[PDB]
Swiss-Prot record, chains A, B:
<feature type="region of interest" description="Important for receptor binding">
    <location>
        <begin position="20"/>
        <end position="34"/>
    </location>
</feature>
<comment type="function">
    <text>Parathyroid hormone elevates calcium level by dissolving the salts in bone and preventing their renal excretion. Acts by binding to its receptor, PTH1R, activating G protein-coupled receptor signaling. Stimulates [1-14C]-2-deoxy-D-glucose (2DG) transport and glycogen synthesis in osteoblastic cells.</text>
</comment>
<comment type="subunit">
    <text>Interacts with PTH1R (via N-terminal extracellular domain).</text>
</comment>
<comment type="similarity">
    <text>Belongs to the parathyroid hormone family.</text>
</comment>
<protein>
    <recommendedName>
        <fullName>Parathyroid hormone</fullName>
    </recommendedName>
</protein>
Curated annotation (Swiss-Prot), chain C:
<comment type="function">
    <text>Parathyroid hormone elevates calcium level by dissolving the salts in bone and preventing their renal excretion. Acts by binding to its receptor, PTH1R, activating G protein-coupled receptor signaling. Stimulates [1-14C]-2-deoxy-D-glucose (2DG) transport and glycogen synthesis in osteoblastic cells.</text>
</comment>
<comment type="subunit">
    <text>Interacts with PTH1R (via N-terminal extracellular domain).</text>
</comment>
<feature type="region of interest" description="Important for receptor binding">
    <location>
        <begin position="20"/>
        <end position="33"/>
    </location>
</feature>
<comment type="similarity">
    <text>Belongs to the parathyroid hormone family.</text>
</comment>
<protein>
    <recommendedName>
        <fullName>Parathyroid hormone</fullName>
    </recommendedName>
</protein>
């Protein structure tokens, strides 16, 4: 049904969310430093 | 300062985590019809 | 979707080949010296 390009798009968004959440968790001490 | 192989392994872990959620969702959907 | 599982699985297989080839390439470069 859903094209491969749409699954790839949705998977890409989920991957971005994972990566951005973990990035912020790691750099949260640096963000407080300002 | 992180290796290319490491970037690949970290991407692969995220992908594998998403895959396990989908596998479990499918297994539960079958099971709930008993 | 099981077509989502198929995609994810095939992407994981491509990534595993990319890592193996990348590992070999790096072992070749390290010896090129």
């Amino acid at each position: 049904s859903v094209s491969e390009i749409q699954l790839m798009h949705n998977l890409g968004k989920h991957l971005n969310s994972m990566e951005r959440v973990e990035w912020l968790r790691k750099k949260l001490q640096d963000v407080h430093n300002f």
